[PDB]
Design a protein around this ligand. Sequence first.
Ligand SMILES: Nc1ncnc2c1ncn2[C@@H]1O[C@H](COP(=O)(O)OP(=O)(O)O)[C@@H](O)[C@H]1O
Length: 303
Amino acid sequence: APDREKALELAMAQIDKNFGKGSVMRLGEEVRQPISVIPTGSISLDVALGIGGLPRGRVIEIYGPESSGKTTVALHAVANAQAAGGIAAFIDAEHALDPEYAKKLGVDTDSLLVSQPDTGEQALEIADMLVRSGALDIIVIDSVAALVPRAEIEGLQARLMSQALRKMTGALNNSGTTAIFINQTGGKALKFYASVRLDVRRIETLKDGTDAVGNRTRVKVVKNKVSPPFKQAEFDILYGQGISREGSLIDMGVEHGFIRKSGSWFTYEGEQLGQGKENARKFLLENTDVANEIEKKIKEKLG
Ligand SMILES: Nc1ncnc2c1ncn2[C@@H]1O[C@H](COP(=O)(O)OP(=O)(O)O)[C@@H](O)[C@H]1O
């Protein structure tokens, strides 16, 4: 009975040694637990990431059809690792950032390092030597696609990446700076260097009695080298306001039973919150105490 597995692990064990950590996993393991991670503003996605947030030191890829949430998740990423001392750098190539928004989310823009490169090449160096300073915690490159090499501006892209990614995946691992890339093209590279790959797509248009409060987004963790992959999460994005914390709690809060649905009436053990997800949201919105409790308990029911 044991000889079988008693060898799988001897093997499986040397596999890690020779190649890494998450080289060979059990989609069922609760395994590991690092003390470095950046929340993403979605408890739903954090437990989905398996480590409660984006691993620091790794390269992260977040792709999906336009207007489905990538950058929103990224700005929060920033918001967090920034509220926690470290600073973030944003290498712009799309030229479509809205600070008033990045701000609401929680970014301290006035102290955010933005760079508007000219070549896709110049961009990866500014991003390279910048990460080497060992100062940035998180850096985000907006659009793996908008990174044209000098030639085209004056095949070579997926090389530009290949090149840059090797020379850059290195430092990152020393530096400890986690890096984010937004996609929709030069793939291959990133599709491998990535330690984590999030697939973000929009599932519904959040109706709010009126016409719309936001969008229900779904993320699928297609690649996870820091824990088991394939787990997925969904959350809401309120038009110009961001990933609804609270709303993320109702859902997580009932899919774990700390919140009961007695027929559209969300109740938190005994006492009611409201009637209609958006109403209970409201309750949670203006009730931080109770809120933090669910989060707290939700957070203790998992890790
Ligand atoms: N400045 C803004 N004002 C209002 N809503 C915004 C703003 N920026 C982003 N959003 C919301 O984010 C959604 C798309 O996410 P981002 O805008 O994250 O796109 P990606 O999904 O990054 O293209 C939009 O449909 C919208 O609901």
